[PDB]
Amino acid sequence: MRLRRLYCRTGGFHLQILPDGRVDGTREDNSPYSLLEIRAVEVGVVAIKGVKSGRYLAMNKKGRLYGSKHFTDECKFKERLLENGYNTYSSAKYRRGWYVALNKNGRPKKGNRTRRTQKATHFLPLPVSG
């Protein structure tokens, strides 16, 4: 059950870390690039690794999500548990309120267009066959 998928509150998507470095949402169940290793690397901070791509979820200085080729400081996300049961993930490196988020088309949002009150930033990590 150690592997997880990250389900968005909106759109019926779960997060995918694709082998070309892109990040998006998919609504398909048999999506190997959506299988994630979510590990706390500091108190309140996680790394999210796409196990099949080998890439870490990352956010660059422009607020854009990508799948990193190795683990860097751009791969750290502050994880907050909301009272509604979902979690938010915000850039630990760029402390500007920049969240992991998917729009209505399943495409990642630019960090400066996100806020913790947006349902697009709300995700549920769920163990796979847990």
| List of residues contacting Na ion (CB under 5 A) | 29, 31, 34
Task: List Cβ neighbours of 95 (8 Å cut-off, separation of 6 or more).
Answer: none
**Cβ proximity of 130 and 124 under 8 Å:** no
Q: Is 4 in the site for Cl ion (CB under 5 A)?
A: no
- Which of 110, 118, 124, 126: binder of Cl ion (CB under 5 A)? 110
Distance CA 119, CA 28 (A): 20
Least CB distance from residue 101 to Na ion, whole Å? 19
Distance of CA 6 to the CA centre of its chain: 7
Q: Residue 7 or 66: which CB sits closer to Na ion?
A: 7
Q: Residue 78 or 110: which CB sits closer to Cl ion?
A: 110
Q: Residue 84 or 105: which CB sits closer to Cl ion?
A: 105
Residues contacting Cl ion: total by CB under 5 A: 3
Q: How many other CB atoms are found less than 10 A from the CB of residue 6?
A: 23
Q: Is 121 in the site for Cl ion (CB under 5 A)?
A: no
Q: Residue 23 or 47: which CB sits closer to Cl ion?
A: 23
Question: Which of Na ion, Cl ion, none does residue 115 bind to, with CB < 5 to 8 Å depending on kind?
Answer: none
Q: Is 113 in the site for Cl ion (CB under 5 A)?
A: yes
Cα 45 to Cα 31, 41, 79, 87, 110: the distances in Å are 26, 6, 6, 12, 20
One-letter identity of residue 91: S
Query: What would the two tokens of residue 62 be?
Result: 């422009």
Interface residues toward Cl ion, by CB under 5 A: 109-110, 113
